[PDB]
Amino acid sequence: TSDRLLIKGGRIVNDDQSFYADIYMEDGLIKQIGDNLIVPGGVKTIEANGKMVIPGGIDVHTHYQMPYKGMTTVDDFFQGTKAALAGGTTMIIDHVVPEPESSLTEAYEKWREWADGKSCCDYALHVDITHWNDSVKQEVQNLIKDKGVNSFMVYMAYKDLYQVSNTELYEIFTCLGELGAIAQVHAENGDIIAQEQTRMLEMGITGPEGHVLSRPEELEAEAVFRAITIASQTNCPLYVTKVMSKSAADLISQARKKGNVVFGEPITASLGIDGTHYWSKNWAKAAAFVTSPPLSPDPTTPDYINSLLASGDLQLSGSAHCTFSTAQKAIGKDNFTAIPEGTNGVEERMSVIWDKAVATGKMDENQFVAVTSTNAAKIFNLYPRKGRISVGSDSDLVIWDPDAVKIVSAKNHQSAAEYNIFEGMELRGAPLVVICQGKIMLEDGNLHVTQGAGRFIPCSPFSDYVYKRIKARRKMAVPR
Amino acid sequence: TSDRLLIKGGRIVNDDQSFYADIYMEDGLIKQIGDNLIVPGGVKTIEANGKMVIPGGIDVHTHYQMPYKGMTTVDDFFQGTKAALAGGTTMIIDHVVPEPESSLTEAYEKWREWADGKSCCDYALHVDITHWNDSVKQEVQNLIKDKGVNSFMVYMAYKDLYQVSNTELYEIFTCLGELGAIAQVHAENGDIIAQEQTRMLEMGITGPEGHVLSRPEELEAEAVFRAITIASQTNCPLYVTKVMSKSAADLISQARKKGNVVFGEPITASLGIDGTHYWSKNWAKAAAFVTSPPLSPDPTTPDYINSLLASGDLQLSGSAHCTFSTAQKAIGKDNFTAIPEGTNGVEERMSVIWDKAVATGKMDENQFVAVTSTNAAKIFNLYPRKGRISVGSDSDLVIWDPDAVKIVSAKNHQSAAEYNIFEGMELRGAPLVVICQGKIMLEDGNLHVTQGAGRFIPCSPFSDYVYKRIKARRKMAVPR
Amino acid sequence: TSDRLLIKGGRIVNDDQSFYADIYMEDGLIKQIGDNLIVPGGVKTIEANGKMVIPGGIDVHTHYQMPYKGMTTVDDFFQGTKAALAGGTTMIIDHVVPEPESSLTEAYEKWREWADGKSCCDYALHVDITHWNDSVKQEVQNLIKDKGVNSFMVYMAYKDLYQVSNTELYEIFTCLGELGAIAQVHAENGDIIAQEQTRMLEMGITGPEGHVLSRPEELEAEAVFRAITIASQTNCPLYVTKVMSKSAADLISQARKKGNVVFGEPITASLGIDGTHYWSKNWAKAAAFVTSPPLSPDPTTPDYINSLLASGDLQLSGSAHCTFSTAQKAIGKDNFTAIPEGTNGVEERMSVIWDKAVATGKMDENQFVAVTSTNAAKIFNLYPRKGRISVGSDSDLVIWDPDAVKIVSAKNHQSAAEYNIFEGMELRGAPLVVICQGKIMLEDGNLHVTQGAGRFIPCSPFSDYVYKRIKARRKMLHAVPR
Amino acid sequence: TSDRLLIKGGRIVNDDQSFYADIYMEDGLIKQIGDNLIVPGGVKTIEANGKMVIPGGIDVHTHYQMPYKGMTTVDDFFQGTKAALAGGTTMIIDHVVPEPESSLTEAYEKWREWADGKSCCDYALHVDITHWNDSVKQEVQNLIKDKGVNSFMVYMAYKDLYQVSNTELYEIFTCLGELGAIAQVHAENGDIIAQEQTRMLEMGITGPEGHVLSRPEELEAEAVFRAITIASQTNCPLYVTKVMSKSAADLISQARKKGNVVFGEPITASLGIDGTHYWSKNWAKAAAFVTSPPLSPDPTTPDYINSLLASGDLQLSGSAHCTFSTAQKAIGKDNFTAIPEGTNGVEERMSVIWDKAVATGKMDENQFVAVTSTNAAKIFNLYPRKGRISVGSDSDLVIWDPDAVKIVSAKNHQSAAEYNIFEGMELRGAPLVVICQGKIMLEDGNLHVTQGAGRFIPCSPFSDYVYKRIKARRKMLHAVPR
């Protein structure tokens, strides 16, 4: 599997504490932690020299080689996970997207085949419920029981394509609750967005600004509140993907304070920048920002999202990395509704949070670990195998430099995209060394990776972190 | 029309101020206000003797002789307005309910005929949009232009009967906004209520408690938030009927603080009592409380609703007076979904608010006037004809006694109902004398009324109180 | 008193409704409202020609010729009320400020003498409680009973000068509540501000930016919350002067929703602009913004204050007009704690609100009247004499042009100040004609005024709008018999 | 030190995860965790049989043998820690209270002597800053550096006894922040409470109900908001003791969301019951509830406090166990201000939280551990030595029965008090076995304890959980060059 490796003089930073210790690794696992380790001679030894050592990042939202209209996103499972590793991320969770009226299981097999053959790092899979009926219900059950899936996503947007009704939502959340799965949502109101898009085009607003104006944050907030409400009535845990706005995040905060089982996933884009760039005079640049929900035009938004990720009102971060070329984006040059949706973010996720939340004093290093790996591992039932530096855990570690300062650019990023939405931003905090599966995959700015080295990691239902309260609530007429 | 009448030594209480003055009336109108009025000899003179004189109450939500399954509510336009006058209310606004797929205009004519022939007092009419299509759109326009209607209601509940989709809501609010009408809603989520009713019956909960448990306040709050959101996107003023819960009222408060044009209508029931009585061992008593949305089981609710009516987060009061006999209620004795919905409240509305909000120190007498007549007159475009004691205004006045104390009972109420949901409650504050159309219709506990004396009062669109901001907001691409 | 005057073809805008009618005025009073008025021939007639006619503005917060260290503010009761009238304001309420350990009543007489002799328009007076003891308590009673005062202000700031303790606040609010007066506060925490000033000076931050950084909005919010709490415990109505920050305005909103009797007074400065200009490289410009509480550095502040004035969470507007010359400001050139505090705002108040809340669609014309006159008249017990176009009310009216557009500048303002904190701002909405005491005092951009023409207007205690709930709450304490 | 011990078949429940494993212990420490442990023959073996095994509770607020007017509370460090252990608590943190104008360090030595000689379990000490001056400042430094103290409490109540001013609060929080200590507060407004007490007595309300009516929750909320504000301005972490009311808990929630470093400590009383019993016709019963801040008369309070402990808006639980006899309480029979303040709670703390938050579905077993030990260990810098079942941690463990159901009564409690404020309450969840310092101190309902067995545990300043953000904020003040 993996050679012996010793990291010396490192400061271990887990979500619960930080402490000085050496780390000995072999065959994909952490074997010893402490001082003066009884270790074989001739072991490859890295001198951490007081630098931080954290669990590798888990990016819970990717779209590598995602199909769209006979094309594919430009970062595939190989190049996309190269990008992840370059940024300190050692596990990704991608979305399987079956065509409406097609098999979920057959889609899952396709995605397993693509990723097993190309991923540089360990991965898992969410399965999107793009339509609903009795056979789909059966497949969901089968996928949870037999295929290592515990997370499924529904769409409240994309009217006449993926969108599900309130009756379907109730049916689906009841089912996912009974089976021990996470119920994920893409939460915007598709019915109202459909009208507003028509309204924008009739006003002659065909550029990317038409995208953000046709999807104001009130339509994200409505759909979030409604999802929270249906999930509560069906005793189902809810996970809100791609939290983009202050109002969505406040609804999640509100629901969690009442005791509702609700999680929020901000992304690199909503943590790092705003939507002013939709009004760029450079069409291509503006189209690079087109994603759904969009980036809020309100410039106070990213500081707020970071604040709520710091306080635990939001719990984990993803990227929704979903890159298209300038030529693909330009398909929608005359009509924003035809711009393929998605931006970059996998490489920049951990640096963006360090820069915006840790160097700003909003969160400490332990909460940084929580919001980049450990909470994700707990929610998806991967803890302590992932998201922790502990004996018996997987050898996925990063030597992090808090003092590193790097300018982001399309020129030096691993993505095949020509644009980078964070172009020109100077970020504090970066990885020096990345170890994945016990092997050194980044050092001295050099990537050392193998196509297909990454393993599918099965995720079991009924995560304790998610379901203990649900179960306790389940456990709890007037005779006339 | 109406004989000369002089009220002397009264303390006039309008929404804006209180002051001592005599009031001279003739032919339906207030002619002079002041001291030492130049008045003809031989005028009928009432000695107010320091007592308050307020504008007659406007009850903006009634259902007199409302049809249901070949029956009718037991209080008709005559007996129902007798009840209103006994309680200090001198104008009512009733709901016209066309069958799905039938003409709105034909329904309006029926209701005009019933009320013109029986009402004791002036009235107006809201028209319920029970279904939606091109011909209904046309009728709405015609009714606003030609028939004195400015208020229309849509249902978010009653799946497969009255319920409208989000696309229909957007269409309808856009239309009502363009035409200068108030958009009213019955705001509960019918899709989810349908599931919960099935769930209650499968648990064997067939009594009235199944009604309140199948319609928890979260389902009122969801639908209110969604209506607020669609109304905001379409620049349409929203009016929430039958505010029953703390969470609904808080959403209205929130929206108004942002600047959204939203009004809330608590009712006598939600101001005066809670939903604990759904669990009464007396089936009949419990069924007397069945209304939609239901009374909150949370006993802190009525004090809170009064508080938000006091602070102006809620603006006006109705009753939704909709009475059925015990025999009619008993149709649903084996299945709560078959209990006809509706309770009493028209007679008790003004006394309930005085007792719960004024004698408690939450609101003063001027705000009492506002929330019982003047705000309703402003919203429905009836001010200063109604809701004000002013020269040239209609002679609809009440001599109110703050020190009166009365126990409510089915035995002494004007309603034909056998039950009164406020049975046994002692209320501070009551009318001594009611003058309507310049005629004394209550004195010494005696009603003096004529069937059909009441006039239809046309209500024009584009009320200033409602539409000035809407118009100003209406009045307010990147070239590449 | 005042000649016959007829305004024809006007659209009257009161707080409750708007309607078309002619207005006939004589001897300081509105005599008739309606169509085809029975009127004597030869009456001076103004053609409003569809333009709005509103009640004159009431500015509830001014500091004309306010003394400070042997000097005075540069706009006195004459020039300051010229400024008021030029902007559509026909009544002002100024603050009487007695020196600590001196008589409130003697201070009141000095102020009455200054204003009676110079004011162009009607006025009233608040009295500031700058210190507290038995004789001050007696004077407050006497002033309410005999001198037409119903509003008194206390300071939670200015440690070792004006500041009162929590015991004194309790005593004072109990007393003012018993006597039917409005309890006004200057609400910032003076103990903590003292420390932060020292911290700014030790960091070498001596310019105007040190002023806003030594008084962060948290210190306004703390004092507001504490004043609300003491006022609630003593059944006393509370009025928060100079609402500057979002957080202060949210606490007032929160308290009103619970039923507490609390009023908030934003000022022209907090409605119109933010505090970014404390960091101007021009010292003199930055010092022109120095006022307390300061303008929020958060640029989302003025939009928010306008939003809460629109929704009624805040009820009335003032200016706290308190102007000093550049030479006077420069006394603090080496130390921001020595910059005399105060900015302009009286002339600009009504246009600022129209431009920022009405032309933006946040409030309608009727709420504009409410927040520029009618709510002030109700709170200070001047309604319907002021703040309303009604038969028997005072002839204080403005013909307002919603379509007028004017750039503000020190060059054309009535103030003697060299700086204007709204310099260069283009504002929508302005007065065309101002009538005061039935007399045309502004027309064609010309002022027609007389020194000393203004009358003191006595203000009685126990305003209904303020006290009916307080009284009902007092009317409603049982031991457990054991 | 301590004999070999093996617990088999147990379900370990830490704050982060639960898992099945055997636990081997020797000489005060957990030595091995796992399956098939290499263990010496003849080891005392307990069969957990699938039952939960959790870290022993840490009660961060006790007042054992606290002096008051020449008397003492009736539960001393021995009997009081017997009560603790009976309820699943294996460590207590008590408050050292020096007389005003006396030495903090001398008080600390007295308390160390009392506890070292009587405590059954490990303990630590907070030191209360009952007055403030230069020598007290020096002692605080000395206690942190040399005596294992990292937590100090100030009083915002008790006017003319312990109360500190806003200047003193600023000075004290600045000092505690610089030294790496937790700043604890007793947060009620003492100035206003003094007035309201006098008001209650003048109304003839002398019974216990006068206590809760003279201290309405608004006066707790005001003091909380002010403490948050001063702590924020001085970059000092704040810990709110005895969170009793919904409004206090909402202010802590609000401040934490903004990023302020603020902790809240609900107590057994506020988690388990309300204040309706102040109106009991039995004087003695009512007086048994007298504590400060008092129990809220609002019966929705305890459900809400449990909800905010569940969501993490409040982080840790104490008891403020402070018991007086009926005869001692009765000293205030004619005047509630003379009733000695304090109730029971140490024994009942963990069962109350299980019954009211876990069996109700508000929180899971892992958050239960967090709020009964682990968050306290992190805040006071005792993690992972305490609050965790981990190799190298202290052998303080409890075998917990989720299915146990017990009625609370004065008849069977360990306290010397005649009254129990939870009398008659049936609580779900109880300890079966308690191990402390590796020794079985509760089994089969029998206590096995030794007077003086407990050790003082030094607590170091600059806890990472508390100070990493504070430090980062300090690391991040430019003048405008003109």
Swiss-Prot record, chains C, D:
Protein's UniProt name: Dihydropyrimidinase-related protein 3
Role noted for this protein: Necessary for signaling by class 3 semaphorins and subsequent remodeling of the cytoskeleton. Plays a role in axon guidance, neuronal growth cone collapse and cell migration.
Source organism per UniProt: Homo sapiens (Human)
Gene Ontology CC entries for this record: cell body; cytosol; exocytic vesicle; extracellular space; filamentous actin; growth cone; lamellipodium; synapse
Organism superkingdom: Eukaryota
Complexes and interactors: Homotetramer, and heterotetramer with CRMP1, DPYSL2, DPYSL4 or DPYSL5. Interacts with synaptic vesicle protein 2 and SH3A domain of intersectin. Interacts with FLNA.
Tissues showing expression: Mainly expressed in heart and skeletal muscle. Also strongly expressed in fetal brain and spinal cord.
PTM annotation (Phosphoserine): residues: 247
GO BP annotations listed: actin crosslink formation; actin filament bundle assembly; cellular response to cytokine stimulus; negative regulation of cell migration; negative regulation of neuron projection development; neuron development; positive regulation of filopodium assembly; positive regulation of neuron projection development
UniProt keyword terms in alphabetical order: Cell projection, Cytoplasm, Phosphoprotein
